[PDB]
Amino acid sequence: MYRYEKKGPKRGVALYSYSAEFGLTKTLEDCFEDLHDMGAHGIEILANTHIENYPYPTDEWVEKWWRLCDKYEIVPVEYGNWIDSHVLGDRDLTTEESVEMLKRDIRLAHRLGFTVMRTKMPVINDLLEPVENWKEIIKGALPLAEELGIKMCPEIHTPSNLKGKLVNDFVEFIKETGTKNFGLNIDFSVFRTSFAEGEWVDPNYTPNKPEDIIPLLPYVYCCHAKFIHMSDDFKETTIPYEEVVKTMEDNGYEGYLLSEYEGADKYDEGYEVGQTLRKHHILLKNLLGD
Amino acid sequence: MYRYEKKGPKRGVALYSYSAEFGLTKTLEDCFEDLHDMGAHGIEILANTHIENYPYPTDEWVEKWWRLCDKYEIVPVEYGNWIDSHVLGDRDLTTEESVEMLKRDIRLAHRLGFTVMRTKMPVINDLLEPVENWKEIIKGALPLAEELGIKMCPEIHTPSNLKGKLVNDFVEFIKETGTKNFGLNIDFSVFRTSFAEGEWVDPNYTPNKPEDIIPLLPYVYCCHAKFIHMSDDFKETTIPYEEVVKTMEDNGYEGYLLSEYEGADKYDEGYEVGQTLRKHHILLKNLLGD
Amino acid sequence: MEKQVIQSVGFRNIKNGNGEITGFQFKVKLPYYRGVFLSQIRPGTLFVDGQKIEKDQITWTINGEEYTNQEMRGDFKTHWATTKPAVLKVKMPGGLAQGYHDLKYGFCFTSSYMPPIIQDGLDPDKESMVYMPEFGHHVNERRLLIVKLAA
Amino acid sequence: MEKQVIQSVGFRNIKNGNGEITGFQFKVKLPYYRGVFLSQIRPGTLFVDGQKIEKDQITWTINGEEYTNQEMRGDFKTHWATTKPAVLKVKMPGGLAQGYHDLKYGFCFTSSYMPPIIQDGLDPDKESMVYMPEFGHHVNERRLLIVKLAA
Ligand SMILES: [Mn+2]
Ligand SMILES: [Mn+2]
């Protein structure tokens, strides 16, 4: 088993960035090697995308997965799952059905070596708050998650502010339970300051300052290094990356920053997202040192 | 085992037509299903292209091959091999090395169910005549070929005329040996009458008339249904297809006509060779009845 | 597979056993960055050469098994993978004639983690107001050939 | 894989064991409608950002095994499949710097069943007089990025 022992923040890639290529021009192994060319070790997969015969992969596939991890020095970091209690049109899932689905994903994530889950829930309002029984769902799975060393993390992304209600609801739950196995994934879109002229921005959105992350860092277990535009000097031109990374270095962050690209041009003929990601990782390697 | 029992000439496809897609946007199974959409049963593969781990496929792969044949009602008809005695830059292969290579390809062709081999040899002159020891090579393999029910066939194609030296050399060999396991593949480019204005044509080439094939039909075991252009009336606009097919029907031909497309536009972005082949097979089904 | 939603491979008339053409099939890939359970799928309307065909004429074969719209609406455990195009089987006696055919087909799927404004008004036969290509277009077209004897 | 001959995946500097960058690698797919035995291959010249690098600096890894040009010239039994790009390893101390790099690489292969005029004058670093796309171009280019610390 390859282990990556760098102290402080580490870089990686979320395979969602390859969403226009995966299954068409890139295989899973192509993505692993693409990360290897970058020297990136951390990976995020989507449970519903990257696991053959999901939800029930074979032993043979699981062993091929572990062989790939060792062959390309990939650390399974974050596992993306959905607790979709709205999967049926006619009714919501019961708390127990949702917990059963979540526990199965925790089991599979543990089997593939992941330690963080990026869990997405159905949202019920414009603040993107989760379903009302979410605490019950999470409390149903927390013992298993604690037993298997997995941390379940909803994702904070635009327009949700680091000082808004959503974040404080999660932090309050963590404080009230005392759990060490539920936390936060901060997507860097919450720091974006620059936008194109005439580009619509949600009036509810206000950029956070990098220091706004400092009081949340005890609960942040993984981050989406979202990025919009990489210049040919290998600088990111919309988010204060130097200051965000320096803030997290200086305040004890030990997790990963996983590149996430979501531009519509991923789906343009001739686009080469692997090159975009290489630009981003030139940036990340120079900011982190490795 | 699927068997196709139509009396008279039968239609199929040579996977060389998919040469720009195979391994990129089409798998072997995609080609099988593409033939199935056409109702085409006969197939030609290239030994050096379509057999995984060639020259030594696994038992598991061979069983997957036979399962594909049954799943899509594909009859393995023609197997394309090279006896490349010029494979080395510094010397020619001995007769024995060439025979050993040929026998291995006959074994593999038999194992995958093929009954005709389209064998290509290094050529030594502008008449495209084979290497001088070719008779010895073929005579080395004929017992095995006769034992396994395989017919080895060099391909006659432009500019070689059906009444030229090349054809008569092969026919003479067949008559002198009496073999029933060496014969001819006639590529329909030998009948092409129409060419584009300003398109270079070999001065040595003269179109054959359809009836020119009649005295060779005892020795023709498979044909490349070469085609250049399919109109939107599903007519071929360069070769007298109605007359060629009617000639072979009326003179007892029981083999296959395997579509072969070689236009440079196969490699153009956006080209859809599967549609070109469907046009050709509308033509072939209407001429043949099935 | 192919970049387009409607695949060129797998488009053909369907026969009987008794030899009669009962309809035709074509394949669609899920144009989504993740798979979905069958109950998330919302099949829409087919147009073949302008002829309208409603979803109750069309079954969905996923993982080798054939499902009606009603069966799919209730099945939240069978998973449709992005790399495994569904086979849509269209009831239509006599099938399609030889030659070209223009297909227009609509379908979509639920994504309950999206903002409520986006979710509300999700229609298999009409596009979202703001196009997000990681979800694909609901409606997709393709011009394809059928191999058949002359009429 | 990719349509281009030079693949974007697998382009990277190579390290030592002792930590020193000894060169770099990139992959090439065989642009041929069939595979070839190693003795058919004719490697040519590499240009990285205009810097010329001769074939005796470049090894070929096929089927997991690394071959010199001389070893390949004599091996007519190992087969290079069209779906299994070769890995070319280029000796170059210190490797390539951070950022963009322009690669131009030439190679070809023998096809002894072709007419003698076509065969004669086959050169890895120069194109045929008449382009036949089922054989690919001998010379191919690509602009690719290297991830590395600043100089
Ligand atoms: Mn994100
Ligand atoms: Mn031919």
Residue numbers in the entry:
A (entry chain A), B (entry chain A): 1 to 290
C (entry chain B), D (entry chain B): 1 to 151
What does the paper say about this structure?
Here, we present the identification and structural basis for the activation of xenobiotic C-glycosides by heterocomplex C-deglycosylation enzymes from intestinal and soil bacteria. They are found to be metal-dependent enzymes exhibiting broad substrate specificity toward C-glycosides. DgpA catalyzes the oxidation of the glucoside moiety of puerarin to generate 3”-oxo-puerarin, in which the 3”-oxo-sugar moiety is cleaved by an unusual C-deglycosylation enzyme complex, which is an α4β4 heterooctamer of DgpB-C, to produce daidzein. For clarity, the DgpB-C and DfgA-B complexes are referred to as PuCGD and EuCGD, respectively.
To elucidate the molecular basis of the enzymatic C-C bond cleavage reaction in the activation/inactivation of xenobiotic compounds by CGDs, we solved the apo structures of PuCGD, EuCGD, and AgCGD2, and the co-substrate structure of AgCGD2 with homoorientin, at 2.50, 2.40, 2.30 and 2.25 Å resolution, respectively. While these three CGDs shared similar heterodimer unit structures, PuCGD and EuCGD formed α4β4 heterooctamers and AgCGD2 formed an αβ heterodimer. The heterodimer structures of EuCGD and AgCGD2 were similar to that of PuCGD, with RMSD values of 2.2 and 3.5 Å, respectively. The major structural differences among these enzymes lay on the interface between the α- and β-subunits; the α-subunits of PuCGD and AgCGD2 (represented as PuCGDα and AgCGD2α, respectively) were composed of a TIM barrel domain and an additional domain with four α-helices (lid domain), which was not observed in EuCGDα. Instead, the loop between M121-N133 of EuCGDα, forming the active site cavity, was six residues longer than those of PuCGDα and AgCGD2α. Moreover, the N-terminal loops of EuCGDβ and AgCGD2β were also short as compared to that of PuCGDβ. On the other hand, 11 residues were inserted in the loop between β7 and β8 of EuCGDβ (T110-V139), as compared to those of PuCGDβ and AgCGD2β, and the loop was involved in the formation of the active site cavity. The difference anomalous Fourier maps of AgCGD2, PuCGD, and EuCGD suggested that these enzymes contain Mn2+ as a metal ion in the active site. In contrast, EuCGD acted on C6-glycosylated compounds 3-5, but not on C8-glycosylated compounds 1 and 2. In the model of EuCGD with orientin, furthermore, the B-ring of orientin also clashed with active site residues including Leu128α and Pro115β.
